Amino acid sequence: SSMSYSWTGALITPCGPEEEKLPINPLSNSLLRYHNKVYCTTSKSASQRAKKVTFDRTQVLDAHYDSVLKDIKLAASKVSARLLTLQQACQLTPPHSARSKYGFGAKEVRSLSGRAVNHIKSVWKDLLEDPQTPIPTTIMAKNEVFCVDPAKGGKKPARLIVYPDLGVRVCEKMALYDITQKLPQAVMGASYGFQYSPAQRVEYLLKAWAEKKDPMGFSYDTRHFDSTVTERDIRTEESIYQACSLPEEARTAIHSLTERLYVGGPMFNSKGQTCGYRRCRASGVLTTSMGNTITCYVKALAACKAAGIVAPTMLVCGDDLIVISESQGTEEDERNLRAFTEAMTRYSAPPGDPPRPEYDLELITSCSSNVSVALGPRGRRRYYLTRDPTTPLARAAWETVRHSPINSWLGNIIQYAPTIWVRMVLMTHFFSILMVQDTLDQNLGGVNPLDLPAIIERLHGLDAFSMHTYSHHELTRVASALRKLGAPPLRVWKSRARAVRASLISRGGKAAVCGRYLFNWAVKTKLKLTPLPEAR
RNA sequence: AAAAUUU
RNA sequence: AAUUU
Ligand SMILES: C[C@@]1(O)[C@H](O)[C@@H](COP(=O)(O)OP(=O)(O)O)O[C@H]1n1ccc(=O)[nH]c1=O
Ligand SMILES: [Cl-]
Ligand SMILES: [Mn+2]
Ligand SMILES: [Mn+2]
Ligand SMILES: [Mn+2]
Numbered sequence: 001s002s003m004s005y006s007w008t009g010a011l012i013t014p015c016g017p018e019e020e021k022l023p024i025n026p027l028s029n030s031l032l033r034y035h036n037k038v039y040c041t042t043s044k045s046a047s048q049r050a051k052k053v054t055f056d057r058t059q060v061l062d063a064h065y066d067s068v069l070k071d072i073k074l075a076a077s078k079v080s081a082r083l084l085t086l087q088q089a090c091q092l093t094p095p096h097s098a099r100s101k102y103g104f105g106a107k108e109v110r111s112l113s114g115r116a117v118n119h120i121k122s123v124w125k126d127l128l129e130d131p132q133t134p135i136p137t138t139i140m141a142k143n144e145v146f147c148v149d150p151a152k153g154g155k156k157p158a159r160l161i162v163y164p165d166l167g168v169r170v171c172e173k174m175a176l177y178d179i180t181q182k183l184p185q186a187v188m189g190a191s192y193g194f195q196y197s198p199a200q201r202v203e204y205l206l207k208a209w210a211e212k213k214d215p216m217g218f219s220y221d222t223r224h225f226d227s228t229v230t231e232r233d234i235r236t237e238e239s240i241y242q243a244c245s246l247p248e249e250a251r252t253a254i255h256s257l258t259e260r261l262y263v264g265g266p267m268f269n270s271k272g273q274t275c276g277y278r279r280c281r282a283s284g285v286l287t288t289s290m291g292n293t294i295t296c297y298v299k300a301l302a303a304c305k306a307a308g309i310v311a312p313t314m315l316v317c318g319d320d321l322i323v324i325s326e327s328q329g330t331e332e333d334e335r336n337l338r339a340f341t342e343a344m345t346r347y348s349a350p351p352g353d354p355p356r357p358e359y360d361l362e363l364i365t366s367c368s369s370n371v372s373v374a375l376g377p378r379g380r381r382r383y384y385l386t387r388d389p390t391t392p393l394a395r396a397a398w399e400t401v402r403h404s405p406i407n408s409w410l411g412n413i414i415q416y417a418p419t420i421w422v423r424m425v426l427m428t429h430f431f432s433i434l435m436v437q438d439t440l441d442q443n444l445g446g447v448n449p450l451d452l453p454a455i456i457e458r459l460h461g462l463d464a465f466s467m468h469t470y471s472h473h474e475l476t477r478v479a480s481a482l483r484k485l486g487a488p489p490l491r492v493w494k495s496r497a498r499a500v501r502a503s504l505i506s507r508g509g510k511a512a513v514c515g516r517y518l519f520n521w522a523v524k525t526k527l528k529l530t531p532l533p534e535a536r
Numbered sequence: 537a538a539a540a541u542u543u
Numbered sequence: 544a545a546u547u548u
Contacts (some may be wrong), residue, residue: 540548541547542544543544
């Protein structure tokens with residue numbers, strides 16, 4: 001029935017200019033050599049993306065769907081949710097949010113300039129009066145950095161971002177922000193992934209695993225999820241929103257956004273031409289994340305039911321899903337998973353790669369990450385979260401006139417501090433760089449490099465400084481990724497680390513603490529690391 | 537472009 | 544600011 005998009009043939013033009021790497025990358029040329037492999041997805045590539053996501057959806061629901069949808073509305077209605085004042089919504093706007101066509105941007109919105117507020121007032125008026133005229137949206141290519149992979153095609157084409165004008169974005173928040181804060185957790189409970197921290201994610205998975213007599217796990221991800229979302233899914237989304245206690249004024253705003261924006265509309269490129277027409281999710285609207293998550297969850301819980309998955313414990317984040325169930329033997333597990341996929345496929349959520357039962361927690365990947373295990377200081381098993389370092393390393397080498405990658409180095413150091421690739425490679429590089437630069441004291445992304453030990457002890461536990469005996473999968477994957485980007489292998493990073501360590505120690509102060517906690521892995525005779533005052 | 541988590 | 548979807 002529904003085509004996902006149609007296209008005039010106008011191009012998807014760039015919003016800014018898309019910078020090139022330069023013949024010299026002075027921050028990362030000591031980190032890796034293969035700079036030719038590191039690229040940013042361009043707007044020229046958007047054409048290729050559009051072909052891959054334009055297709056005809058058909059959808060066939062069933063008693064299991066209906067049943068799951070019903071139960072989900074009974075959950076929804078134990079929720080009441082308020083409108084947000086025009087003003088409170090204005091100030092959830094991000095500081096750099098793309099400006100409005102009507103002569104103001106986010107500074108004005110956040111400061112409640114009166115031109116901005118009056119335009120927003122009229123926009124909300126029109127939402128309440130007119131509940132049908134479609135609302136124009138802008139279409140743009142997302143710029144992100146990867147490492148080329150010739151196995152899987154060369155370069156990925158850019159994903160498509162589709163969004164309404166700033167005025168409209170504020171009105172969405174007025175109508176729905178409060179819902180986004182309450183509905184998913186109410187509807188999905190413990191299954192709602194975003195509620196958890198990484199530590200909690202890991203623990204939730206181990207508890208789920210431990211409680212099965214005989215566990216089986218898998219993960220699922222939908223190919224081009226936003227384009228698989230049907231008009232009917234979006235209206236069913238509305239009807240889930242409506243099932244809460246709402247002010248009548250919200251209901252009209254919800255219903256109107258739904259019919260005017262969410263289910264479809266025309267799309268314009270940055271130069272103003274009509275680009276095409278859309279009848280799936282616009283990724284760029286306030287409801288993108290909540291919607292995806294709720295919709296994914298309905299389809300998934302139904303498909304579990306269609307396929308016989310026993311005692312499923314779920315975890316859902318957007319279109320990404322893990323299910324840990326009671327195995328019915330491998331012959332049955334294979335068959336049930338094929339059934340799961342058939343169902344999701346009927347529901348219009350077809351797999352990127354077909355899923356597969358697993359019986360070892362390390363082999364389940366979701367949101368480009370997985371759980372792994374090492375040994376702690378006293379020899380106890382320590383479970384932690386990690387990932388292929390390929391992309392983060394490529395992003396670590398993205399230097400342009402307009403972009404430094406140092407913040408990315410730090411981001412990953414914090415998020416993945418227990419991993420062997422952060423501890424040996426990124427930490428070593430980061431500290432080496434700043435020492436020589438003599439900018440340790442300086443803040444970056446509102447964090448002081450010299451706090452890191454406290455920060456990591458707070459977030460990952462003191463065990464992140466003493467972990468050893470990493471897994472084969474993890475050693476293999478790391479070695480393989482450093483070889484792939486032409487970076488030095490782990491032994492060299494051991495040498496560089498000893499030096500960085502010595503120089504930090506002999507600097508005294510917080511540096512020396514950094515050098516002793518972060519790099520104790522690097523010395524032959526360890527120290528005994530005690531908790532840190534600063535952390536509690 | 538939107539959200540969540542981390543800080 | 545970082546990461547993720
Ligand atoms: C664009 C999205 O709606 C997207 O389709 C969905 C699932 O992401 P995915 O990583 O599995 O990609 P597919 O589209 O399924 O190929 O998460 C949203 N999403 C994802 C990435 C992003 O920057 N913004 C976004 O709103
Ligand atoms: Cl231990
Ligand atoms: Mn997907
Ligand atoms: Mn309605
Ligand atoms: Mn996904």
